[PDB]
């Protein structure tokens with residue numbers, strides 16, 4: 103790699119970070135959008151106030167404002183559903199470590215309730231909330247309402263640092279390695295500039311996913327993050343070994359690799375900043391399919407990239423990885439659904455199944471009520487799109503289990519439902535090839551009617567090759583496609599994936615059988631379960 107390749111390609115100008123004049127040749131259309139107008143200005147200079155007053159039909163008549171609503175608004179966590187729910191916006195939060203309060207949950211419910219049949223909410227595969235139905239004129243008030251209840255939606259889409267994932271059992275599991283909440287909280291504060299916006303990290307070449315590990319179970323999926331902090335003691339000091347570059351895309355899926363770096367626990371934010379600065383400064387900005395950070399690591403080599411991180415650290419110090427980390431490889435991933443004792447004597451948590459992560463306003467209010475009556479007003483989200491209510495006095499569990507709402511959001515659903523994960527799909531998502539959430543529930547129910555099993559088989563349904571529902575981590579994955587029935591008629595289908603493993607012995611699954619009509623999946627899946635996962639026909 104020539105020295106010229108290492109010249110930073112962006113510069114700070116008037117509070118924002120912009121591509122230098124000599125580094126604009128050959129850039130992709132998204133990079134052009136960012137040059138034409140700085141997206142962060144919609145929040146930080148309150149550009150949203152006037153934009154929100156323009157009728158959407160008028161907005162669509164000019165490129166600048168159309169790009170404002172379809173692209174730039176994703177820096178404020180607002181996602182126009184142009185194709186599938188025209189004029190409505192999904193809104194996505196920052197929710198480090200998946201932690202919400204009952205007051206926040208009620209606020210979110212109040213927002214979606216206004217929109218009737220156009221509103222609902224979802225738990226995401228980054229243990230985050232999305233709300234739906236939002237209309238542009240309401241955006242300024244919703245931004246204010248979120249701030250009032252201690253939430254932000256900043257920098258949650260597009261070329262930004264995505265939700266910091268942690269251990270859903272942080273602070274409460276007798277078996278945790280280290281409480282991840284202080285670290286994911288710090289990361290979210292850093293990323294969003296304490297909810298004011300942080301332009302230094304909002305002009306990346308592409309999205310970037312961080313997680314902090316605190317569980318032997320590896321609930322945080324460090325192998326598929328751009329930056330994963332693996333807890334490790336080095337020379338008698340507590341800190342983290344760093345994995346970099348994990349990502350999924352249509353073109354390529356890659357597991358994170360060691361940076362060969364250990365940082366003291368107090369250097370979590372400094373090293374996040376250094377890595378982001380290197381990626382921002384040096385990453386390719388052409389073909390969008392080659393802009394994730396791993397492509398930079400391959401271009402420079404991991405050592406070349408490491409040197410760029412090192413030079414951006416305070417005092418330019420970046421130790422080599424600890425020979426060992428704290429994660430025990432002898433481990434069986436633990437079910438968190440149901441009632442479990444906490445490390446605090448006399449307290450339990452309860453994991454509740456949320457079918458395909460989908461809730462309505464009334465459901466959110468009920469869950470918030472349970473959290474107040476039984477817990478400490480806290481609701482935790484998981485990356486399997488379920489919930490945990492922590493801090494419940496154990497003597498209250500008997501009463502809790504009789505609550506009517508637990509017949510719907512169950513502490514002990516059938517085993518295949520426990521492991522079922524599904525993305526948005528074509529109900530709302532414009533890129534989706536198939537419907538996912540309703541279909542996946544239907545198929546899973548039919549499969550479980552036919553077979554019993556004891557292995558915790560994890561089934562993931564994703565609507566297109568973007569693989570937001572991570573089919574490559576599944577025991578059985580389903581990637582949406584269009585295919586043909588016996589008569590040559592167009593039908594919805596799935597490419598079926600096998601081989602995904604999670605935890606310490608992780609492995610990326612691969613296509614097993616392409617183009618299976620969705621109406622033909624049940625027998626295929628039943629047989630796979632009997633033949634490979636010990637399932638028994640009923």
Ligand code: SRM
Pocket residue numbers: 181192194224225226227228229230231232258259264265309311326348349350351352391394524525526530531532533568569570571572
């Ligand atoms: C909601 C969520 C799936 C879910 O049902 O849980 C989701 C939904 C969308 N993803 Fe995703 N992604 C979700 C997690 C992911 C993950 C999984 C993860 O983070 O572990 C991946 C694969 C891992 C990765 O990125 O490395 C993922 C890879 C994509 C990609 C492909 C990335 C790439 O490099 O090519 C796109 C398209 C893009 O960004 O260019 C994308 C694009 C989208 C958009 C924003 C596209 C769009 O605007 O319509 C989807 C919004 C649909 C909607 O209305 O909900 N989504 N997406 C997840 C929100 C996470 C969050 O709270 O921030």
Ligand code: SF4
Pocket residue numbers: 525526527528531532533534535564565566567568569570571
């Ligand atoms: S995998 Fe495809 S269909 Fe599913 S939410 Fe992501 S972009 Fe939409």
Ligand SMILES: O=N[O-]
Pocket residue numbers: 259309570
């Ligand atoms: O929002 N999925 O990158």
Ligand SMILES: [Cl-]
Pocket residue numbers: 176259260
């Ligand atoms: Cl996006």
Ligand SMILES: [Cl-]
Pocket residue numbers: 182183184185186531532533
């Ligand atoms: Cl769309």
Ligand SMILES: [K+]
Pocket residue numbers: 455456457458459486487488522523
């Ligand atoms: K779920």
